[PDB]
Amino acid sequence: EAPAAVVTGAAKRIGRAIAVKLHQTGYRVVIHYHNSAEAAVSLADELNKERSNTAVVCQADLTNSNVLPASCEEIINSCFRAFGRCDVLVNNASAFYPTPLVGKTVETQVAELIGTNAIAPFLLTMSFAQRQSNLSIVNLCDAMVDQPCMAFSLYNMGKHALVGLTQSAALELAPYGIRVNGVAPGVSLLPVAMGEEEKDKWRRKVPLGRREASAEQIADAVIFLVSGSAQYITGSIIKVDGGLSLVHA
Amino acid sequence: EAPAAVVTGAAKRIGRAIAVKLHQTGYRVVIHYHNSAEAAVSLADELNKERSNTAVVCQADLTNSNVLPASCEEIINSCFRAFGRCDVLVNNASAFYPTPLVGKTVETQVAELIGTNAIAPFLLTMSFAQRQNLSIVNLCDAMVDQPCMAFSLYNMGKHALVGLTQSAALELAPYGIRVNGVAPGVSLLPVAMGEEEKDKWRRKVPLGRREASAEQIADAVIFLVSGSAQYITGSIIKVDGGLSLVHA
Amino acid sequence: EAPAAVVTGAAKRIGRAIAVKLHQTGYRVVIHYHNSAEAAVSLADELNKERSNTAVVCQADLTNSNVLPASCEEIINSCFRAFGRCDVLVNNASAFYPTPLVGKTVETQVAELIGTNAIAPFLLTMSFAQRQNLSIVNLCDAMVDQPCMAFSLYNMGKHALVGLTQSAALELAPYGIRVNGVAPGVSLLPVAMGEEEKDKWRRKVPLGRREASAEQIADAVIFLVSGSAQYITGSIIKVDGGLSLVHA
Amino acid sequence: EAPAAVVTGAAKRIGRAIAVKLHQTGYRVVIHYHNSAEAAVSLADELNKERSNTAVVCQADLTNSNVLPASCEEIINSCFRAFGRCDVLVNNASAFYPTPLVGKTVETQVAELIGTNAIAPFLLTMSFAQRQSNLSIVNLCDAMVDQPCMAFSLYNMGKHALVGLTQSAALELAPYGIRVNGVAPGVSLLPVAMGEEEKDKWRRKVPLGRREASAEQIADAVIFLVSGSAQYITGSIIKVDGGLSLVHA
Ligand SMILES: NC(=O)c1ccc[n+]([C@@H]2O[C@H](COP(=O)([O-])OP(=O)(O)OC[C@H]3O[C@@H](n4cnc5c(N)ncnc54)[C@H](OP(=O)(O)O)[C@@H]3O)[C@@H](O)[C@H]2O)c1
Ligand SMILES: NC(=O)c1ccc[n+]([C@@H]2O[C@H](COP(=O)([O-])OP(=O)(O)OC[C@H]3O[C@@H](n4cnc5c(N)ncnc54)[C@H](OP(=O)(O)O)[C@@H]3O)[C@@H](O)[C@H]2O)c1
Ligand SMILES: NC(=O)c1ccc[n+]([C@@H]2O[C@H](COP(=O)([O-])OP(=O)(O)OC[C@H]3O[C@@H](n4cnc5c(N)ncnc54)[C@H](OP(=O)(O)O)[C@@H]3O)[C@@H](O)[C@H]2O)c1
Ligand SMILES: NC(=O)c1ccc[n+]([C@@H]2O[C@H](COP(=O)([O-])OP(=O)(O)OC[C@H]3O[C@@H](n4cnc5c(N)ncnc54)[C@H](OP(=O)(O)O)[C@@H]3O)[C@@H](O)[C@H]2O)c1
Ligand SMILES: Nc1nc(N)nc(N)n1
Ligand SMILES: Nc1nc(N)nc(N)n1
Ligand SMILES: Nc1nc(N)nc(N)n1
Ligand SMILES: Nc1nc(N)nc(N)n1
């Protein structure tokens, strides 16, 4: 029987690439999304046309709040409801925008940037474990955490807390046979808002090929970590960055 | 005149030691507290006996909430009001307790652990910078990569605090504000910890089989705020007697 | 045409499993050995029974010395002479024994421990690049920051190997040669070791309270040389079942 | 009885500043040097003019070889011979030059770069410990070890091995009360051979003041680590880089 995976923020870009690759490997998938309903449903439709009844969507805001635990509980419940099991969780959804130190309130920015990057992964990890073979969680981290974007303090804090979660959860869940790992892109799909000149500035920094990672290349590392070829790997974060993090200023 | 420092959670233990050493170095000090009013005021009394009107207290809950930004703004403001300047911020206040993955609600645990260890430091940092040998020192944790079992939220908080230290060092460098950390291993053990478990921890420490005194932790803070650290920013100084080097 | 790989110290244990898994994946292999001729040849004969003319052995001492550069050039040249190409280099061979600070001379210890773990990888890297999905995989150690007591030279050698992996990744990226590491925690235990001492290590590992098989270490090498890792360079994959996360 | 310190490569630049500040703090000093004899003797003259019988020179090549152990033993012995004790060892001497992967032979480049940066510190640490209060060793590391200079592999390997030595020796020597720490400069005194345009490029990269560290600012972190205010600190490396290592490519 086929295993099942939850991928958060899976309607487009890297999340979709991960969902597609998991599906192609034989997984049934929960495509979680927040605002991108049309894109989520379109993806699910495509996957179901490939194999009937192997993809569902699940909407949730992952901003921190007093109901976020219930929302995260429900995302995991959706996978059991659809598929009768949940073997893999991929924590991909992520808010990403500057929060300079010197029209959202700061409370809102904290809730979105720390909620999506750290607290939702933590809650989803609790629910995934409590509901529980090759079980694992993969956290989408960031290879540039130690050389961060200027004025992205809250985003950086969130990704650092996600490294902490990866370690803490690997240590604590190892007795239950749940592995917990991360994949840390350097530059992959650039933001849709970014102009080509700015994109090329980033591309030219990358030693290996002077180009960003494809979404599929990030997905490849995720697929590795969930596979039987990684059955002794837990608490590891695989950088997928073409050498970018090695390049001094 | 004399420089001024804000120390969060300064009533007891490591915070108190840090406040005392800054004061002894010549700083005027804002002694922040949440529940420990009596201890905070007693420290203030002691420091003001030494030099009149050089210590004040400031109460605030640092749990994450809708009012946390205003609370952090007011802590920084209290330093400007008392002393007309704020040269140093020490982010020491910290909740510490287990949050297993498998009667506080989980959202309260998130608010307290991530609030005290990360979000409050962030807001205090914003307010401190907006109001401007200026520096910030964050109390980190040498065991972040080898964490206590079932302490995931605490560990996330401390990791986020490393992130803030790096991001703020980078962004505040142009303003001449240095941002560093001190990472204790085992210092003063929890009051709740039984003496047998305390001894198990002490015996793990390569350098002297004992915990760091609060004063030993404060020494590294004093270094980091001093003119001997004027080129140091984005650095976290481990003060753990080699504990983090010891394998399982 | 089938690609070709050099695996150092490939006669036994992890290097043998790497060589076998590469061979199963379709590589022709140079099985480097130092003292284990019989085991090297038996592996070669086995692989060649599977597919004719797909394995050769190559003897060399990787101790540091003024002939080490030529020995390393010769190892690489052997792969070209056998197979007309060299796609993959696996730096696996490694001396490992204590060197306390307080019958081998210290300079022999330095030559063996630094030569096998660091300088030989460096020279083999040079020769591999000069001769050019090309990649190098260095066998590192998940415990370099929490090292075995009295293994300073070994630990220095493994840290230097991390430096090599990063510096070579950076410098060889323009030629399309990726350079990565795999860092075991506890894998195959020393053959010497009593089961009672073996079990002490096994019990420290969160994930399954057992050591990694050589095949599990090999699986990570196979991933890193594969098309699924085409954008990965300068990365060290820990394969340690959580061992390195466990405090003292 | 004043304490005594050995500083390697102490005739010029950073090692000189360290020797001077240690002396100002009350230490007697062995000024080790290799080629800079005039400078070494001139420094020793200055220190002794300030307090008689408080400085000696010691010449030694720290290139790796079969006689490196004896040379390192001799450096430590020189401190006991002059001062009757040896409280502090500062591993500062260092070769620094590129060694591309693609007039010195490679054997020589390995010997000089790995010898000075890693093997000499190791043998000096061994001799120091065997000859044995506030005892400590301070290793001059490099903040840029993870974002290395292009084509400096052997130098980088040497500095990484020195991080390994700092940790391993801190662990093993802790029961003897000998602390082992490091100081990791980013950009400090630039190479004498470096053109001024290049020095300025480097300076512009440093967030904290857009200037390199003085030798004195590096020395300040060394004197902190040797001092009574660092008595619980062992196995720590203090970055003194003005934020340089935080800046992405
Ligand atoms: N792209 C890169 O170069 C890069 C670099 C380093 C790290 N990463 C990491 O890799 C992962 C994927 O990157 P990406 O660029 O594909 O991500 P992204 O496009 O910026 O965001 C992925 C999804 O996150 C979801 N999301 C945002 N806010 C949310 C909220 N409040 N509640 C629930 N979901 C929310 C969105 O879902 P909806 O669209 O449905 O609203 C969005 O499609 C992220 O974790 C990212 O940090 C990416
Ligand atoms: N002690 C150690 O061995 C050790 C080890 C590693 C890291 N550290 C770090 O070093 C620092 C000092 O350690 P410590 O053991 O002295 O700390 P602590 O005693 O656990 O806590 C310090 C103070 O934090 C304040 N605090 C707690 N929750 C708060 C809240 N919601 N709002 C405002 N303040 C709150 C409390 O002030 P009130 O009493 O006034 O309520 C408390 O006295 C902490 O950052 C800690 O993480 C310590
Ligand atoms: N086993 C573990 O638990 C563990 C843990 C962490 C890291 N690792 C790393 O994983 C790798 C493989 O480990 P392993 O236990 O399989 O290694 P190993 O058995 O200790 O040694 C591998 C081979 O290295 C070769 N070697 C030793 N000295 C040499 C010299 N002077 N010149 C040439 N070759 C020499 C030997 O070849 P001959 O037999 O032909 O003489 C030996 O069979 C090593 O890099 C090791 O550090 C292993
Ligand atoms: N300068 C920087 O920006 C910077 C940046 C990162 C790290 N660091 C580290 O800080 C420390 C001091 O830096 P620095 O720039 O002052 O060093 P440096 O000037 O490049 O070297 C200092 C001394 O090392 C000695 N030395 C070189 N090769 C030797 C050998 N084979 N045997 C014995 N001694 C040898 C030389 O002594 P003689 O002149 O007597 O021959 C030289 O004066 C070094 O460990 C360095 O790697 C410095
Ligand atoms: N969420 C997110 N994170 C990063 N690092 N980059 C983009 N484009 N989105
Ligand atoms: N806040 C806090 N953090 C730690 N690590 N230890 C103690 N006792 N308190
Ligand atoms: N070479 C080697 N290295 C380690 N770490 N362990 C064993 N058994 N051998
Ligand atoms: N030995 C040495 N090392 C560095 N990093 N820089 C200079 N100038 N010298």
Coordinates of N, CA and C in Angstrom, one line a residue, chain A residues 157-234:
Chain A
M157 N 15.5 34.9 12.2 CA 15.2 34.3 13.4 C 14.3 33.0 13.3
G158 N 13.3 33.1 12.4 CA 12.5 31.9 12.1 C 13.2 30.7 11.5
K159 N 14.0 31.0 10.5 CA 14.8 29.9 10.0 C 15.9 29.3 11.0
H160 N 16.5 30.2 11.8 CA 17.3 29.7 12.9 C 16.5 28.8 13.8
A161 N 15.3 29.2 14.2 CA 14.5 28.4 15.2 C 14.2 27.1 14.5
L162 N 14.0 27.1 13.2 CA 13.7 25.9 12.4 C 14.9 24.9 12.4
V163 N 16.1 25.4 12.4 CA 17.3 24.5 12.6 C 17.2 23.9 14.0
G164 N 17.0 24.7 15.1 CA 16.8 24.2 16.4 C 15.7 23.1 16.5
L165 N 14.6 23.4 15.9 CA 13.5 22.4 15.9 C 14.0 21.0 15.2
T166 N 14.7 21.2 14.1 CA 15.2 20.0 13.4 C 16.0 19.1 14.3
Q167 N 16.9 19.8 15.1 CA 17.8 19.1 16.0 C 17.0 18.5 17.2
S168 N 16.2 19.3 17.9 CA 15.4 18.9 19.0 C 14.5 17.8 18.7
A169 N 13.8 17.9 17.6 CA 12.8 16.9 17.2 C 13.5 15.6 16.7
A170 N 14.6 15.7 16.0 CA 15.4 14.5 15.6 C 15.8 13.7 16.9
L171 N 16.3 14.5 17.9 CA 16.7 13.8 19.2 C 15.5 13.2 19.9
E172 N 14.4 13.9 19.9 CA 13.3 13.4 20.8 C 12.4 12.3 20.1
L173 N 12.3 12.4 18.8 CA 11.4 11.5 18.0 C 12.2 10.2 17.5
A174 N 13.5 10.3 17.6 CA 14.3 9.1 17.2 C 13.8 7.8 17.8
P175 N 13.6 7.8 19.1 CA 12.9 6.5 19.8 C 11.6 6.0 19.1
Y176 N 10.8 6.9 18.5 CA 9.6 6.5 17.8 C 9.9 6.2 16.3
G177 N 11.1 6.2 15.9 CA 11.5 5.9 14.6 C 11.1 6.9 13.5
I178 N 10.9 8.2 14.0 CA 10.6 9.3 13.1 C 12.0 10.0 12.9
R179 N 12.4 10.1 11.7 CA 13.7 10.9 11.4 C 13.2 12.4 11.1
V180 N 14.1 13.3 11.4 CA 13.8 14.7 11.2 C 15.0 15.4 10.6
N181 N 14.9 15.9 9.4 CA 16.1 16.4 8.6 C 15.7 17.7 7.9
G182 N 16.6 18.4 7.3 CA 16.3 19.6 6.6 C 17.0 19.7 5.3
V183 N 16.5 20.5 4.4 CA 17.2 20.9 3.1 C 17.3 22.4 3.1
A184 N 18.5 22.8 2.8 CA 18.8 24.3 2.9 C 19.2 24.8 1.6
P185 N 18.2 25.3 0.8 CA 18.5 26.0 -0.5 C 19.4 27.2 -0.3
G186 N 20.2 27.6 -1.2 CA 20.9 28.9 -1.2 C 20.0 29.8 -2.0
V187 N 20.3 30.0 -3.3 CA 19.3 30.6 -4.2 C 18.7 29.6 -5.1
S188 N 17.4 29.5 -5.0 CA 16.6 28.7 -5.9 C 15.7 29.7 -6.6
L189 N 14.4 29.3 -6.8 CA 13.5 30.1 -7.6 C 13.5 31.5 -7.0
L190 N 13.9 32.5 -7.7 CA 13.9 33.9 -7.2 C 12.4 34.4 -7.0
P191 N 12.3 35.4 -6.2 CA 10.9 35.9 -6.0 C 10.3 36.5 -7.3
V192 N 9.0 36.2 -7.4 CA 8.3 36.7 -8.6 C 8.4 38.2 -8.8
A193 N 8.4 39.0 -7.7 CA 8.6 40.4 -7.7 C 9.9 41.0 -8.1
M194 N 10.9 40.1 -8.1 CA 12.3 40.5 -8.4 C 12.5 40.8 -9.9
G195 N 13.2 41.9 -10.2 CA 13.4 42.2 -11.6 C 14.6 41.4 -12.1
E196 N 14.7 41.2 -13.4 CA 15.7 40.3 -14.0 C 17.2 40.7 -13.6
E197 N 17.4 42.0 -13.6 CA 18.8 42.5 -13.2 C 19.2 42.1 -11.8
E198 N 18.3 42.3 -10.9 CA 18.5 41.8 -9.5 C 18.6 40.3 -9.4
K199 N 17.8 39.5 -10.2 CA 18.0 38.0 -10.3 C 19.4 37.7 -10.8
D200 N 19.8 38.3 -11.9 CA 21.2 38.0 -12.4 C 22.3 38.3 -11.4
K201 N 22.1 39.4 -10.6 CA 23.1 39.7 -9.5 C 23.3 38.5 -8.6
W202 N 22.2 37.8 -8.2 CA 22.2 36.7 -7.4 C 22.8 35.5 -8.1
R203 N 22.4 35.3 -9.3 CA 22.9 34.1 -10.1 C 24.4 34.2 -10.3
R204 N 24.9 35.3 -10.6 CA 26.4 35.5 -10.8 C 27.2 35.2 -9.6
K205 N 26.6 35.1 -8.4 CA 27.3 34.8 -7.1 C 27.6 33.3 -7.0
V206 N 26.8 32.5 -7.7 CA 26.8 31.0 -7.4 C 28.0 30.3 -8.1
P207 N 28.9 29.8 -7.4 CA 30.1 29.1 -8.0 C 29.8 28.0 -9.0
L208 N 28.8 27.2 -8.6 CA 28.5 26.0 -9.5 C 27.4 26.4 -10.5
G209 N 27.9 26.9 -11.7 CA 27.0 27.2 -12.8 C 26.4 28.6 -12.9
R210 N 26.7 29.5 -11.9 CA 26.2 30.8 -11.9 C 24.7 30.9 -12.2
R211 N 24.0 30.1 -11.6 CA 22.6 30.0 -11.7 C 21.9 29.5 -10.5
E212 N 20.6 29.8 -10.4 CA 19.9 29.3 -9.2 C 19.5 27.8 -9.3
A213 N 19.3 27.2 -8.1 CA 18.8 25.8 -8.1 C 17.4 25.7 -8.8
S214 N 17.1 24.7 -9.6 CA 15.7 24.5 -10.0 C 14.9 23.9 -8.9
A215 N 13.6 24.0 -8.9 CA 12.8 23.5 -7.9 C 13.0 22.0 -7.8
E216 N 13.1 21.3 -8.9 CA 13.3 19.9 -9.0 C 14.6 19.5 -8.2
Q217 N 15.7 20.4 -8.3 CA 17.0 20.0 -7.6 C 16.8 20.1 -6.1
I218 N 16.0 21.1 -5.6 CA 15.7 21.1 -4.2 C 14.9 19.8 -3.8
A219 N 13.8 19.6 -4.6 CA 13.0 18.4 -4.4 C 13.8 17.1 -4.4
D220 N 14.9 17.0 -5.2 CA 15.7 15.8 -5.2 C 16.3 15.5 -3.8
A221 N 16.7 16.5 -3.1 CA 17.3 16.3 -1.8 C 16.3 15.9 -0.8
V222 N 15.1 16.5 -0.9 CA 13.9 16.0 0.0 C 13.6 14.5 -0.2
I223 N 13.6 14.1 -1.5 CA 13.3 12.7 -1.9 C 14.3 11.8 -1.3
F224 N 15.6 12.2 -1.4 CA 16.7 11.5 -0.8 C 16.4 11.2 0.7
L225 N 16.2 12.3 1.4 CA 16.0 12.2 2.9 C 14.8 11.4 3.4
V226 N 13.7 11.4 2.5 CA 12.6 10.5 2.9 C 12.8 9.1 2.5
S227 N 13.7 8.8 1.6 CA 13.9 7.5 1.1 C 14.6 6.5 2.1
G228 N 14.6 5.2 1.7 CA 15.3 4.2 2.4 C 16.8 4.3 2.3
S229 N 17.3 5.2 1.4 CA 18.8 5.4 1.3 C 19.3 6.4 2.4
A230 N 18.3 6.9 3.2 CA 18.7 7.9 4.3 C 18.2 7.3 5.7
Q231 N 18.0 6.1 5.7 CA 17.3 5.5 7.0 C 18.1 5.7 8.3
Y232 N 19.4 6.0 8.2 CA 20.2 6.3 9.4 C 20.4 7.8 9.6
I233 N 19.9 8.6 8.7 CA 20.1 10.0 8.8 C 19.0 10.7 9.5
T234 N 19.3 11.4 10.6 CA 18.4 12.2 11.4 C 19.2 13.4 12.0

